[PDB]
A paper describes a structure:
Two additional proteins, among others, are also required for Agrobacterium tumorigenesis: VirD4-coupling protein (CP) and VirD2-binding protein (VBP). VBP is responsible for recruiting VirD2–T-DNA to VirD4 CP to help localize T-DNA to the Type IV Secretion System apparatus for transfer. Sequence-based predictions revealed that VBP has two domains: an NT_KNTase -like domain at the N-terminus and a HEPN (higher eukaryotes and prokaryotes nucleotide-binding) domain at the C-terminus. We show that the C-terminal domain is the dimerization domain of VBP and only dimeric VBP is functional and essential for the induction of tumor in plants.
Subsequently, we generated a new construct that consisted of the C-terminal domain, and obtained crystals that diffracted up to 2.7 Å resolution. The structure was determined using the single wavelength anomalous diffraction (SAD) method.The asymmetric unit consists of two monomers forming a tight dimer. Each monomer contains a six-helix bundle with three long anti-parallel α helices (α1, α2, and α6) that forms the major part of this domain, and three shorter helices (α3, α4 and α5) that stack at an angle to the long helices. The dimer is held together by tight interactions between α1 and α2 helices from both monomers. A DALI search for the structural homologs of VBP C-terminal domain identified several proteins with a HEPN domain; this confirmed that the C-terminal domain of VBP adopts a HEPN fold (hereafter referred to as HEPN domain). Asn186 is located at the edge of a loop connecting the α1 and α2 helices of the dimer interface. This residue, along with Lys184 and Asp173 of one monomer, is involved in hydrogen bonding contacts with Asp173 and Asn186, Lys184 of the second monomer. We found that a single substitution of Asp173Asn, Lys184Asp or Asn186Asp in the HEPN domain is sufficient to disrupt dimer formation, as verified by size-exclusion chromatography and analytical ultracentrifugation experiments.
Residue numbers in the entry:
A (entry chain A): 151 to 295
B (entry chain B): 151 to 301
The structure:
Amino acid sequence: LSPADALRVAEDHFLRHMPDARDFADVAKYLVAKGNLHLAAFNLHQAVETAYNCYLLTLTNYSPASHNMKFLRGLSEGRDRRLIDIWPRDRQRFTTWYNIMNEAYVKARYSKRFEVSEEALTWLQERTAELHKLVETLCREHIEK
Amino acid sequence: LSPADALRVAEDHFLRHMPDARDFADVAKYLVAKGNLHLAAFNLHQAVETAYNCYLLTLTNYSPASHNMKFLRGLSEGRDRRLIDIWPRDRQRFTTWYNIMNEAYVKARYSKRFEVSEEALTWLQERTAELHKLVETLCREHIEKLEHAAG
């Protein structure tokens, strides 16, 4: 509630959180190089969650505090339709793969098995990189002057 | 219940989890090089949690499923006193620093402020590396490779 404050606060959010998101995606790449695909999916999950958190905070000064994936994605696509392109459902395997990441937070550290191919991970990386590019753009476009 | 099964299962656990723990500690180093100290603390928290989870699974085929830190540490030190050396309280800053990591799972991704110095992180890295060395050793020492003598 105040033109100059609202700018300060939206800059603070975006600078605080977008770099966490980029870094999680980098950690994932690192872990793929290591051969630890399950923990890379976990980092991809975090890259994506953090990216949405960053989006919602920057543009509305609020984020759920569950930080639920479906929820934060829901809310974010609800605030700007351009974000739906990120996760196309024109092939089934795209949902299989996406669900692997979603399962990865809860499982992945803890389950005895957690199956994810190289191909799935390459796809989730491409998709995360577009989410990050777009989210970065949409956050800059929110410039109060 | 079964000498050869119990060995298979304890190897499976340790091989499944110890490498997650090492890898979290490595990720932390990587993030320290990147200048992202808050997320490195987060990975350190996971390196430690995963290490204790690995310990308790290997030796007892069970782990809480809270995966609470105080808890899993409590349980793990309760089963082998050697693990108390890992987190000495002979300086106050050691408790400040440890608490930073503990707070790091919950905060750190989410909070606006999360303060952790280079010195703190270096100390948490050294400590995590001893936990991992010790845990690795205690897991190998758990060998029912003898108790399947009765073949």
